[PDB]
């Protein structure tokens, strides 16, 4: 939902911000073994899965991607982009969440703000 445009004097400050917020439960070391069990279930070795969120994600992504033939490598790359976190230093005004940083080229300028509100659902930590 777009809104009006406001011209004004804007100050941007440089900060570390999230591109991908990742899954909050997996810690970025469990996520890789999850990716391994989903895509390469026989080549994982000794690692059992412990947490309940791991099993939930595993069964979900395992019944979704049942008999696909896209490629295991690309499926793994995209699951990484889904699950693991990724940061970057950028100049920022306004919102710092990831849904507001993918559109920072459109919401914020040198002289102008563009009101905008993404469409999906929002996490309550941000709120």
């Amino acid at each position: 939902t777009f809104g009006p445009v406001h011209f004004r004097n804007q100050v941007k400050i440089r900060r570390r911000v999230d591109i991908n917020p990742g899954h909050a439960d997996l810690s970025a070391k469990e996520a890789q073994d999850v990716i391994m069990e989903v895509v390469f279930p026989n080549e994982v070795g000794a690692r059992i899965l412990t947490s309940e969120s791991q099993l939930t994600i595993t069964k979900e992504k395992k019944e979704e991607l049942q008999d696909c033939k896209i490629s295991p490598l690309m499926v793994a790359y995209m699951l990484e982009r889904e699950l693991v976190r990724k940061t970057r230093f950028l100049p920022v005004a306004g919102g710092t969440s990831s849904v507001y940083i993918e559109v920072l080229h459109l919401t914020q300028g040198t002289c102008w703000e563009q009101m905008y509100t993404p469409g999906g659902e929002v996490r309550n930590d941000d709120v």
């Binding site: 279930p41 026989n42 080549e43 994982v44 070795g45 000794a46 059992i48």
Partner: protein
């Protein structure tokens, strides 16, 4: 002691045992009797697996030597005589096919009739404490256990025995032969063994 275990066993056993000892990160000279125990484990597993082939059902039909035909199916699949990666790969493939449970530590065999793993052990000390050691290590288990003793008496879970008694007798004959050929050399005393020696070895450049 290394000389004896090189003399007695055929070179496949000692080859794979030295491979496994190198993979462990140990020194064959600082730790020796472990090498002989590993050789014995390898040999009894090979004998437990060899002289066994499968029928349309399970419950192995035994042969002197396998007949040449499509019926190549062994009842037993060997796990421990392998590298770490290939062994865990066999395990995970099995667990993902039959929906079985995944162990935490590597078993030694897999049996198709009753569809479960087996963890053979061989001990100088008699059974019923090593059994519970094996059990509380193998927690939440379906894998059968079948432990031997140098004296001539064995043990199992549920009083279950996964093969003939004649093959057990063969294992026991080989084992007693080993023990009281050891007694001739006088190295039986050194079998009360445990992992020792400081493996935190100094770095040297």
């Amino acid at each position: 002691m290394e000389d004896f275990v090189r003399q007695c066993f055929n070179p496949m056993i000692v080859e794979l045992a030295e491979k496994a000892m190198k993979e462990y990160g140990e020194d064959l000279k600082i730790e020796t009797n472990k090498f002989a125990a590993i050789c014995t484990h390898l040999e009894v597993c090979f004998m437990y697996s060899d002289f066994h082939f499968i029928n349309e059902q399970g419950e192995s039909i035994v042969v002197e030597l396998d007949d040449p035909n499509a019926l190549l199916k062994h009842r037993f699949e060997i796990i421990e005589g392998r590298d770490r990666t290939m062994a865990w790969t066999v395990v995970n493939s099995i667990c993902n096919t039959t929906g079985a449970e995944k162990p935490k530590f590597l078993p030694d065999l897999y049996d198709y009739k009753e569809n479960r793993f087996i963890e053979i052990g061989v001990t100088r000390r008699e059974v019923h404490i090593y059994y519970l050691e094996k059990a509380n290590k193998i927690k939440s288990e379906n894998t059968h256990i079948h432990i031997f003793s140098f004296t001539g008496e064995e043990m199992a879970t549920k009083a279950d025995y996964t093969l003939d008694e004649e093959s057990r007798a063969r294992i026991k004959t080989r084992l007693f032969t080993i023990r009281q050929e050891m007694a001739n050399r006088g190295l039986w005393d050194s079998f009360r063994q445990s992992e020792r020696g400081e493996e935190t070895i100094e770095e040297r450049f």
